Amino acid sequence: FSMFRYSNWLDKLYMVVGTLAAIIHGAGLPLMMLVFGEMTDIFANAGNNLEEDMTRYAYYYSGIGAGVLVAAYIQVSFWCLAAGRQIHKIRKQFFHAIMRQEIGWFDVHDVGELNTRLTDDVSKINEGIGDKIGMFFQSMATFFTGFIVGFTRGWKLTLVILAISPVLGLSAAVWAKILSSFTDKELLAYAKAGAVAEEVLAAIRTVIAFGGQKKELERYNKNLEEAKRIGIKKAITANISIGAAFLLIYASYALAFWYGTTLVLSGEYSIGQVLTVFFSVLIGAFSVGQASPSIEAFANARGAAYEIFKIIDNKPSIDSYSKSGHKPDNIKGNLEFRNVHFSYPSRKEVKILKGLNLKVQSGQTVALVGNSGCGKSTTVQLMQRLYDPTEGMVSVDGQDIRTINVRFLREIIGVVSQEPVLFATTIAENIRYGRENVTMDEIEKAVKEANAYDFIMKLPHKFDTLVGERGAQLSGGQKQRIAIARALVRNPKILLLDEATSALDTESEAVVQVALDKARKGRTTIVIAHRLSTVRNADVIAGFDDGVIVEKGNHDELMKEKGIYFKLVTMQTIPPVSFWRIMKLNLTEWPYFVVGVFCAIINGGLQPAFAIIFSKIIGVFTRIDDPETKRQNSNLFSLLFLALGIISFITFFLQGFTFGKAGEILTKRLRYMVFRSMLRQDVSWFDDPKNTTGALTTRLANDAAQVKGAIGSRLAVITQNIANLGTGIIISFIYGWQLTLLLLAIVPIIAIAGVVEMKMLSGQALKDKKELEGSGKIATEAIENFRTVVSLTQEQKFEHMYAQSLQVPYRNSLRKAHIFGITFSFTQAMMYFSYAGCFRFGAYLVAHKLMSFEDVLLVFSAVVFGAMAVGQVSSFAPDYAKAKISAAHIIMIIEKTPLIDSYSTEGLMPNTLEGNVTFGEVVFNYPTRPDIPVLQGLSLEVKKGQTLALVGSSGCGKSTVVQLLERFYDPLAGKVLLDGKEIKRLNVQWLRAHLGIVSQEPILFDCSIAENIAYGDNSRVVSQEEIVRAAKEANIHAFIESLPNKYSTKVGDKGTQLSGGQKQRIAIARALVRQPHILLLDEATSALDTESEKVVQEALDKAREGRTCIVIAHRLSTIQNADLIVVFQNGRVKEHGTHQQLLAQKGIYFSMVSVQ
Ligand SMILES: COc1ccc(CCN(C)CCC[C@](C#N)(c2ccc(OC)c(OC)c2)C(C)C)cc1OC
Ligand SMILES: Nc1ncnc2c1ncn2[C@@H]1O[C@H](COP(=O)(O)OP(=O)(O)OP(=O)(O)O)[C@@H](O)[C@H]1O
Ligand SMILES: Nc1ncnc2c1ncn2[C@@H]1O[C@H](COP(=O)(O)OP(=O)(O)OP(=O)(O)O)[C@@H](O)[C@H]1O
Ligand SMILES: [Mg+2]
Ligand SMILES: [Mg+2]
């Protein structure tokens, strides 16, 4: 897919013009080097009227700068605008195709995956085609023009530069490869600690229950040691790469200076020519190297566009926009589905429909019979043309469905799904989407027929009542009524209904059925429902069976036949950050960071030191004396450069050595602390979307980088830039004053332009993301419910909505592109203007015999090159704002403290426990939703030698009762006593270790089976004999021994090798290993091999001796086993007492006993 540009051939002229302008701009700079060399030669000759030549050179430079500014502006703006238009066209076409694709194909591919692909690849293509191509062309032009200037300026110097360049290129490539490999290795190494932390967090409930934070922290630290070693190595490698790059650059500078000096002394090209050739060649090589990101983005967008086009270029079997079918004006109710075989493309192995014969008259309430997966919903979908028969025939009114106008059939048909959904728009908006041609009378008619008058009118904006995201403001019955009204709005030739009132209750069932039967003579109504009451009244009823119809006839006939229908009938019967707090790693590298500070100062002086060395070298030729021995002096100066280079390399050898060693350490500290803070966090805090397992893992992982950057690299860059600026400014002021003022007025304008570049880039990215998300809200709303939209056949409406939502920000995108191009051009414009003005005014100054040309050149080079290097260094460090925010969040998390300290030292820990507990007037809903008080003041009391059972409120929050008993949360109200003692005042770890609490679906940590067993209670070693005894007690001795490797075997990811029964048995064995005084099981039975579950329960009852056992199970046996049974209802104990008395009561216990 190399050739990606595919639209607006006329607009392609914009691309051609932009390419030409970029080439002109790129070739401009070598011309700048040539003219600067000529000006330097003129100045040197003056050292050996003058104002006239200086004015001519300044005029040439100013003209070149203005032309380069115009070219840059034109190229940037044109490329950006053309790419934006192309991206808009691509997005529009892509969304059109997606909405026009096949429904079955959409079911084939993930909806979320496709939505993310669109919303991401759009920006990927925009980035890879926006300006990176323009910058690449400009860099190629710079390379070509620099090479041409070098060749036309001299042979020996050009050869030397060409020989120097590829060594630097290869060194840069090797350094980049090493850095990438180191980063990948470090991420892989840290993955172990990341997995450990993720497992701990996900198992947070079990971890807190067992109080095993110590072992997890130890493992995390063990991994973090190697992780920090690798990170320090990688940081040192990156710093050494930068150092070696600078050292090689300086060495090339010194070698070129020596060679040019020798040539000039030998009568070769003048000093100006040699300097121009050298600088032009170096800058061209720099541009060639800097062209890489454009090519990388080109390749990335190439792959993205290949995938996107493949998606778009797909030709769907069912096309919404297609109109090749014949659409008769008069439709008479007549449907035929003969030998209709149909299989889901998602699951092609099984043919859900294996052929059947069925006919449908006109205006007949055809009803379908069959159990789940019998072929009812799929039958309707095939009838609705959502798919086609694998082997069969489908026709309407004596005509094949495919042989008719797809759009007309879709519009003239009505489909009501068992799970109706309304778009996120006002009820009136959704109704209009159902039928725009209603004319405001059909709306009222439907509202009255479906009874959408009271509910519809009640909400604010009776007709225009807005519905929350996904229609969260409407109830199930109201939603079903609205869907029915919307279906009736179209008044289709035929309609189909499923799950009339299968949402919450049959109250709407009566009204819904009455309304549906009110208007059914004029159109055939496919009847689908979960209640035989509605099915009985059907005029015509037919059965389904394994993709075939056997039973048939009305309710009376079906009952007489005593078929499957008769069987069903019988069955019915943003905190602020602290900058100083950031200095918490000083305890590690406070004296160590001094070496890094010294290295940074050394580099920031070396830059201006190189400036001074170059000034001296230039002055050597500028010296009128020009002795032969001056060459030696020149060599001396040249030698200095080489020395400076070494000082650079060693300097880097220190920087990465220090900061790395510092930063990783700090990282480790944070890693040791942040997660530790998470460990000592109340379970209440864990109940929060902000504290999401994935979110917490990402914060822990993608925060060490931010904190380390903000701490180390921010200070490093600040110090380096400050040192460079101070040294340069001081040197320039010492060597002249007026030129110092000129350079100080010139350079900061360029610096401000460079900063504004990044500011505008970030702001534009944010604004583009905002607008794209604005459009994508509606895009996704349509995509997720794609089936409903297709049924409605209103795809054009969503297409128009997306078109408007994209056009509205398209103009803003174009304007931003134009402004950014203008600013980018102005950057180079100011650059060249200042470059020329500095030379002009320095020539004026020296013409007055005030300042020597050598000093002026020194000051100018210092200012310009130092400013450029400072900007590059500032860009080198990652973003401070994002790093600052991440550090603020990490510091807030670490400083966070728990209302109840799980690691608190103090705590009431009497000699033993009374084996009793009491909770009266208990009140605690939850942290997330306090609007639902769960405990309404229940009463519960456990004593010695008694087991408690929970019944009645199977869903009111019984598990919450166990959780609170474990102190997982804090009661909203109600007194609680631990064996007549303050539960809160009790010990922290003592209570956690004492209680053998289990969960519904325990997740076994992916460690050794023996390791999992021993995880029951740390701080007291668990000899393998104890594990064996616990396994024997919990029927796990045979299970553990039979399992390969015996106890040595380790469970996979949450015990993937063993079924849920094995995991439950292992959890029970671990609990028994804990040997708790009091034990609790909460709905761990389920089915889980009913005989096996009963055996496990019997073992537990035999294990309940000398302990208080809490039992929460949905099995009558569990109710019988419990010594004491307490019910729950309305947050209170509806029933309680003995099992015989509870059964005697006519209460929820009686209903459960009878029904169960
Ligand atoms: C797209 O990025 C670029 C932007 C502008 C330029 C041209 C810069 N010229 C006006 C010369 C200024 C000085 C210069 C820079 N930058 C520089 C001086 C000293 C340096 O330290 C040794 C240096 O290395 C970072 C670069 C160039 C010699 C490469 C090159 C670019 O490619 C690197
Ligand atoms: N991609 C798929 N592959 C296989 N089976 C699927 C697929 N999508 C849905 N199914 C299921 O296959 C069955 C097809 O039968 P159909 O839905 O027509 O009858 P049903 O008994 O009314 O269905 P359901 O049990 O869904 O209410 C349904 O149970 C449906 O949920
Ligand atoms: N942080 C929370 N905020 C709000 N509701 C929560 C929170 N955590 C859990 N819940 C809800 O509390 C209930 C948990 O206890 P639940 O009612 O399921 O216990 P139960 O009586 O054993 O019922 P069942 O066995 O039917 O699930 C669930 O409704 C769960 O959605
Ligand atoms: Mg169904
Ligand atoms: Mg439960």
Instruction: Decide whether any atom of ligand 1 lies within 6 Å of the 872 Cβ.
Output: yes
The residues near 1095 (Cβ < 8 Å, ≥ 6 apart) are: 1035
- ∠ CA 1013-1016-1022 to the nearest 5 degrees? 65
- The CA 600 to ligand 1 mean position distance, Å, reads 20
C-alpha angle 416-417-418 in degrees, rounded to nearest 5:
125
Whole-number Cα distances in Å, 688 to 9, 506, 900, 928, 1002: 53, 36, 17, 7, 21
Task: Please indicate the experimental technique that yielded this structure.
Answer: cryo-EM
Report the C-alpha gap between 767 and 1096 in whole angstroms: 61
Q: Give CA–CA dist 214/578, Å, rounded.
A: 30
CB count within 10 Å of CB 283 equals: 17
What residues are paired with 357 via a beta bridge?
338
Neighbours of 987 (CB within 10 A): 16
Q: At what angle do helices 292-313 and 132-153 cross, to 10 degrees?
A: 140
Q: Are strands 1124-1127 and 948-951 parallel, antiparallel or unpaired?
A: parallel
Domains of the chain, by residue range, sit at 335-572, 917-1155
CA distance 585 to 708: 10
Answer yes or no: are the C-beta atoms of 442 and 519 closer than 8 Å: no
CA of 961 to the centre of ligand 3 (A): 10
CATH number of 335-572: 3.40.50.300
What is the Rg, in whole angstroms, of the alpha carbon atoms belonging to the chain? 40
Could you give the CA distance from residue 110 to residue 386 in angstroms, rounded to a whole number?
A: 18
Of the chain, the end-to-end C-alpha distance in Å amounts to 65
Residue 992 neighbours by CB distance under 10 Å: 18
Give residue numbers after which the chain breaks (C–N above 2.5 Å). Answer: 48, 573
* Residue 202, CA distances (Å) to 86, 506, 659, 1004, 1008 in order: 45, 40, 34, 11, 18
Q: Cα dist. 985→642, 684, 1041 in Å?
A: 73, 18, 43
The CA-atom distances, in angstroms, between 96 and each of 69, 83, 802, 803 are: 40, 20, 9, 9
Contacts of 1128 (CB under 8 A, 6+ apart): 938, 950, 951, 952, 953, 956, 958, 961, 1134
How many residues belong to the chain? 1156
Ligand nearest to the CA of 691: 3
DSSP 831: H
Amino acid at 628: E
Residues 6+ apart with CB under 8 A from 235: 656, 659, 660, 663, 664
User: Which pair of structure tokens corresponds to residue 290?
Assistant: 């800097």
Are 919 and 975 spatial neighbours (Cβ–Cβ below 8 Å)? Answer: yes
> d(Cα 91, Cα 806) in Å, to the nearest integer?
9
Q: Look at the alpha carbons of 938, 944, 946, 947 in this order and tell me if their dihedral is positive or negative.
A: positive
The angle, 0 to 180 degrees and rounded to 10, between the axes of the packed helices 714-734 and 853-876 is: 170
What lies within 8 Å, CB to CB, of 285 at 6+ separation is 143, 146, 161, 165, 168, 169
- For 1015-1068, the DSSP string reads TT--SS---HHHHHHHHHHTTHHHHHHHSTTGGG-B--TTSTTS-HHHHHHHHH
Tokens 């210092």 -> residue: 862
The C-alpha atoms of residue 1026 and residue 1007 are separated, in whole angstroms, by: 18
CB 908 within 8 A of CB 985: yes
Distance separating alpha carbons of residues 1054 and 1129, to the nearest angstrom = 35
Residue 270, beta-bridge partner list: none
Ligand 1 pocket test: pick from 641, 863, 865 the residue with the most ligand atoms within 8 Å of its Cβ: 865
The angle at the Cα of 543, spanning 541 to 549, to the nearest 5 degrees, equals 130
Q: Answer whether 245 contacts ligand 1 (Cβ < 6 A).
A: no
3-state secondary structure of 1078: strand
Report helix, strand or coil for 902: coil
How does DSSP classify residue 320? Answer: S
Distances in Å between the Cα of 672 and the Cα atoms of 23, 221, 680, 981, 1052 are 54, 7, 12, 36, 27
Say if CB 747 and CB 863 are below 8 A apart: yes
Phi, psi of 495 (to 5 degrees): -135, 160
CA-nearest of 146, 185, 165, 180 to 34 is 146
| Ligand 3, residues at Cβ distance < 6 Å | 687, 926-929, 953-960, 1083
- Residue 119's nearest CA partner among 783, 763, 764 is 783
Residue in 378, 381, 415, 546 to alter for ligand 2 test, most ligand atoms within 8 A of Cβ: 378
CA distance 831 to 110: 51
CA 498 to centroid of ligand 5, rounded, Å: 32
Please give all residues whose beta carbon lies within 6 A of any atom in ligand 2, as ranges: 344, 346-347, 352, 370, 372-379
Same fold, 335-572 and 917-1155: yes
Question: Is the distance from CB of 362 to CB of 483 less than 8 angstroms?
Answer: no
Q: Is 1137 helix (H, G, I), strand (E, B) or coil?
A: strand
- Count other C-beta atoms under 10 Å from residue 980's C-beta: 9
Task: Report the alpha-carbon distance of residue 139 to residue 471 in Å, rounded.
Answer: 53
* Alpha carbon distance 1036, 1042 (integer Å): 9
Task: Give the number of other CB atoms < 10 A from CB of residue 1021.
Answer: 8
Distance in angstroms (rounded) separating the CA atoms of residues 829 and 66: 6
- The annotated binding site is made up of 370-377, 952-959
Distance 373 CA to ligand 2 centre (A): 5
Count CB neighbours of 905 within 10 A.
8
Residue 373 phi, psi (nearest 5): 70, 15
State whether the beta carbon of 869 lies less than 6 angstroms from ligand 1: yes
Q: Do the strands 917-923 and 391-396 form a parallel or antiparallel pair, or are they unpaired?
A: unpaired
Across 58-92, b (16+ Cβ under 10 Å) vs e yields bebbbebbebbbebbbbbbbbbbbbbbbbbbbbbb
Question: Considering only CA atoms, which of 671, 672, 729 is closest in space to residue 705?
Answer: 671
Q: What is the dihedral of CA 1093, 1094, 1099, 1102, to 10 degrees?
A: 150
Nearest to 610 by CA among 240, 247, 241, 166: 247
572 CB burial (10 A radius; 0-12, 13-18, 19+): exposed
DSSP 590: T
For the domain covering 917-1155, report its CATH number.
Answer: 3.40.50.300
- Neighbouring CB atoms inside 10 A of 523's CB total 20
**What does the alpha-carbon distance between residue 1025 and residue 1022 come to, in Å, rounded to a whole number?**
8
Distance CA 203, CA 1006 (A): 11
- State whether the beta carbon of 265 lies less than 6 angstroms from ligand 1: no
User: Tokens 């050598």 belong to which residue?
Assistant: 854
Of 925, 950, 956, 959, which is best to mutate to test ligand 3, by the most ligand atoms within 8 angstroms of its C-beta?
959
The region that residue 182 occupies, defined by phi over 0 for left and psi between -120 and 50 for alpha, beta otherwise, is: alpha
Q: Three-state DSSP class for 229?
A: helix
Three-state DSSP at 137 gives helix
Torsion angle (degrees, nearest 10) of CA 928, 929, 933, 934:
-60
**Residue recorded with tokens 């008259």:** 361
Spatial contact of 271 and 44, defined as CB atoms under 8 Å apart: yes
As to burial, measured by CB atoms within 10 angstroms (0-12 exposed, 13-18 middle, 19+ buried), residue 1069 is buried
- Reading the block at residue 199, the tokens are 């497992």
- Cα(87)–Cα(103) distance, integer angstroms: 26
Cβ neighbours, 10 Å, residue 520: 17
d(CA 415, CA 487): 7
- CA distances (Å), 415 to each of 184, 272, 381, 383, 788, in order? 53, 83, 9, 10, 9
Between CA 412 and CA 435 the distance in angstroms is: 11
Binding residues for ATP: 370-377, 952-959
Q: Which ligand is nearest to the CA of 861?
A: 1
The alpha-helical segments, DSSP class H, found in 522-629 are 532-536, 555-561, 564-572, 586-589, 593-622
- Extract the tokens encoding 734: 């010492």
Locus of tokens 């030696």: 632
Other beta carbons within 10 angstroms of residue 509's beta carbon come to: 21
Smallest CA separation from ligand 1 atom 3, residue: 287
Check: CB of residue 708 under 8 Å from CB of residue 664: yes
Which residue owns the Cα nearest ligand 3 atom 31? 957
Residues near ligand 5 ion, CB 5 Å cutoff: 959, 1083
Contact 129, 83 (CB under 8 A): yes
E strand residue ranges, 397-512: 399-400, 413-416, 494-497
Give the Cβ contact number of residue 521 at 10 Å: 12
Q: Give the span between the Cα atoms of 192 and 682, in whole angstroms.
A: 26
Q: What is the DSSP letter of 439?
A: T
Q: Quick check: 54 and 841 in contact, CB under 8 A?
A: no
- Which residue's C-alpha comes closest to atom 16 of ligand 2? 375
Show the tokens assigned to 535. 């099915």
